[PDB]
Amino acid sequence: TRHPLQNRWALWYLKADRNKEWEDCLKMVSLFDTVEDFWSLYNHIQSAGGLNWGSDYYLFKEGIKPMWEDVNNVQGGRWLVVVDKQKLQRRTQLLDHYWLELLMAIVGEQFDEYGDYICGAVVNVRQKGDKVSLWTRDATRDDVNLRIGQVLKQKLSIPDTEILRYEVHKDSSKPRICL
Amino acid sequence: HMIRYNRDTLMTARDTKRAPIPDEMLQEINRVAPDILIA
């Protein structure tokens, strides 16, 4: 069987190593461009919830480096979701729900007519609070980023109560949108 | 021009998947990230 994806995606893995710099812990694990290979990959690697504290997964379109300085990210920003309210297994379960729902929404091109503006997704597994982020290309496009944020909240069942922040990458070196 | 797969379609494809992981993928995971490999 073969269900081709609109885009070819690269999964990256940041291995926590207290002795090494970010760039020296990051590895491009695999590229994939079908539904089958997406699930083969996801099925055979640790879920976000099974990673050691300090680890990251990144999923970015092929050719986009998972760093804000990349030409495809530099004028862009991210929607940020922080997972820090719940505890132990409930927090872990919510983290895994957010990450996989996000990955499905991305590779399945579910962000209405704005898929060209999606760069990638990032999960940071951290003892103090996990972070799940959706990175977009152009921080000046409020129309794009607002709609993308709405879909994000819908897909991940993020309550109207919890307010998501869209942060501009450049400013990180105060949210532009709150939702 | 747009290829889309909704949630139910993707999940159904996972639930009914029987084909194994391509060997090239498995070997790449083992090469660069053996510690996250599940089998």
Side-chain angles (χ1 to χ4, degrees):
Chain A
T1 185
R2 181 159 165 289
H3 297 71
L5 299 177
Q6 189 52 68
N7 281 290
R8 187 149 160 90
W9 300 90
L11 181 79
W12 305 72
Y13 168 54
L14 187 85
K15 187 174 191 309
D17 185 331
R18 59 174 309 139
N19 291 310
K20 295 185 174 294
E21 242 181 279
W22 182 82
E23 54 198 19
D24 297 313
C25 296
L26 185 66
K27 298 160 310 317
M28 204 293 277
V29 170
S30 184
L31 287 147
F32 62 87
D33 64 11
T34 67
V35 170
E36 292 77 9
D37 287 349
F38 166 68
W39 283 129
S40 291
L41 174 62
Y42 190 83
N43 281 344
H44 288 87
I45 71 186
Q46 201 63 254
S47 72
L51 298 175
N52 294 331
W53 295 127
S55 309
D56 304 334
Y57 278 140
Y58 315 84
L59 190 81
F60 279 75
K61 287 181 187 162
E62 183 187 15
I64 307 181
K65 299 162 171 188
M67 50 189 68
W68 77 269
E69 296 98 331
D70 186 279
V71 54
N72 297 286
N73 297 317
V74 73
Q75 297 183 48
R78 64 179 189 170
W79 281 106
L80 172 69
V81 184
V82 184
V83 191
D84 60 7
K85 293 164 187 172
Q86 291 264 52
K87 273 182 146 185
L88 302 180
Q89 200 169 13
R90 294 205 203 268
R91 180 176 142 189
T92 305
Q93 284 161 354
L94 189 60
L95 172 63
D96 282 325
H97 176 75
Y98 284 172
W99 183 237
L100 183 54
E101 290 293 332
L102 180 50
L103 294 182
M104 286 193 298
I106 290 166
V107 302
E109 299 288 324
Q110 292 293 288
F111 289 95
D112 281 12
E113 76 274 38
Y114 290 129
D116 289 303
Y117 297 80
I118 301 294
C119 294
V122 178
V123 54
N124 312 109
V125 169
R126 304 288 189 281
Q127 205 173 338
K128 265 298 200 308
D130 313 283
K131 298 182 281 205
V132 174
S133 296
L134 177 54
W135 287 32
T136 69
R137 168 181 328 278
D138 201 341
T140 76
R141 298 292 305 274
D142 298 315
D143 50 332
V144 173
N145 294 328
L146 175 58
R147 179 58 192 156
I148 283 174
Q150 292 164 349
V151 172
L152 176 66
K153 288 195 66 164
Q154 203 288 310
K155 292 287 175 172
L156 278 57
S157 306
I158 301 170
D160 301 338
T161 83
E162 196 172 343
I163 303 175
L164 302 194
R165 303 164 40 95
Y166 184 88
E167 309 168 340
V168 180
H169 292 317
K170 277 184 259 59
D171 299 346
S172 307
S173 63
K174 188 74 194 71
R176 165 156 191 148
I177 317 176
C178 292
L179 192 59
Chain B
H1 62 323
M2 273 304 313
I3 302 164
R4 308 184 196 272
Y5 301 99
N6 65 31
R7 188 174 178 284
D8 294 341
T9 300
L10 287 181
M11 286 184 73
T12 295
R14 190 193 192 182
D15 295 340
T16 63
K17 191 180 181 280
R18 289 298 184 277
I21 175 172
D23 191 45
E24 308 189 12
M25 184 182 293
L26 178 65
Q27 292 325 314
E28 190 67 4
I29 295 171
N30 250 308
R31 186 176 72 78
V32 309
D35 55 302
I36 62 168
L37 184 69
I38 290 172

